[PDB]
Amino acid sequence: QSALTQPPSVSKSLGQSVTISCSGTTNDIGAYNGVSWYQHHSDTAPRLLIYEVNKRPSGVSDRFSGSKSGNTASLTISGLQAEDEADYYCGSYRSGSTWVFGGGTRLTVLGQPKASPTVTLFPPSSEELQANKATLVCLISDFYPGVVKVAWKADGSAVNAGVETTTPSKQSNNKYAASSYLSLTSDQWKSHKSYSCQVTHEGSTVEKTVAPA
Amino acid sequence: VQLQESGPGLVKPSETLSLTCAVSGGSIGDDYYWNWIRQSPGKGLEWIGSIYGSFGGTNFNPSLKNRVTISMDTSNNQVSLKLNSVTAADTAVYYCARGSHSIVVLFGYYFDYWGQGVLVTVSSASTKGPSVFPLAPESTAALGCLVKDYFPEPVTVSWNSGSLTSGVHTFPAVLQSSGLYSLSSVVTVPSSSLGTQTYVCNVNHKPSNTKVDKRVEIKT
């Protein structure tokens, strides 16, 4: 029942140091020196950083250190790198022989260079068109910060439906990716002279166009 | 040294999620906790329970103790999990993880070795294999495969049977209001190699037991 409370999000700049707290109870963090910390990147297994409050496994740099005071534990990360953007979870054994993970803290590393999106737009394949469908695919890559707005146009005019866009997700190079799909019929696709994918990122827009002819 | 989760990636509401954790390079019967932990956006990391290798002692997350079973098969070095009466709230990537420890009543335990995790989607909707379409491709060329309207996740996409890994980028799937997913994988290649190199996306949707190797043509 009782959670280990972490701030959901925390921000600190490159090179700086950050401290992430984890507030537990007298029955876990207060009862044992059994606090551990885990790094979790997108599409990766959670990674043990700290165990028994302040011990590091081999292969975890000394930039990570842990401490506890009363019922609160803390993870400090010094020399913040882009690579450090991830979710960080504390966790502790709990009297009664259960184990509880904190809610996790998403770390954003500030001071990083803006990366404008690479936008690739595909028209429907001829195979899909033979199936009387036309899906336009807008692929958006290598952007940071990971916030975009995707809009579509037909004959230079705003498309109001048929759009489904993904949430930005982290790439292994720490930048973000996203994608957007305009789902039409073949007849609809042929009904306009052109279609556009417009990706807005940090106030600026990259637009790609395809034409049925 | 290694943990490998397996089990049905799609489970219907009210049915039982069952997973197995194949452990390699260490006996399940040794002095370790073997743990099930799940991960979802909505619930972060959640410890589900653990079984202690040396005597079989189990301990469970009190929030779902009422419907969790954990056992081990010393014979084939497997640890298993059953979670029943499952709902969409149990959709998650499920991990097997080893709990190492010193003196537990002083230092608890912690998870040093994890499996890869297995996605389990709890849904009443039917499995659907994807339709795969070429995305035909100026100094560099983007070509790809649209993997359209499948359910559930995941889909894996390699290129040329894995011999092509450089410049490969497989995008997270979109989830449409139809309840169906679409994803795209594209490989960015030198345009000079479009004449010399065949490009095949290898699409694997294990949930529908479907593989598609799609040759990506340069169209006319």
Residue numbers in the entry:
A (entry chain L): 1 to 6, 8 to 27, 27A, 27B, 27C, 28 to 95, 95A, 96 to 106, ...
B (entry chain H): 2 to 35, 35A, 36 to 52, 52A, 53 to 82, 82A, 82B, 82C, ...
Manuscript text:
We report here the immunogenicity in rhesus macaques and CH103 CD4-binding site bnAb UCA KI mice of sequential Env immunogens derived from the CH505 HIV-1-infected individual who made the CH103 bnAb lineage. In macaques, vaccine-induced nAbs  had epitopes overlapping that of CH103, bound only open trimers, and neutralized rare tier 2 viruses. DH522 lineage mAbs did not neutralize tier 2 CH505 TF, neutralized 7% of a panel of 199 HIV-1 primary isolates, and blocked the binding of CH103 lineage Ab (CH106) to CH505 TF gp120.
DH522 lineage antibodies, DH522.1 and DH522.2, were isolated from blood memory B cells after four and six immunizations, respectively.
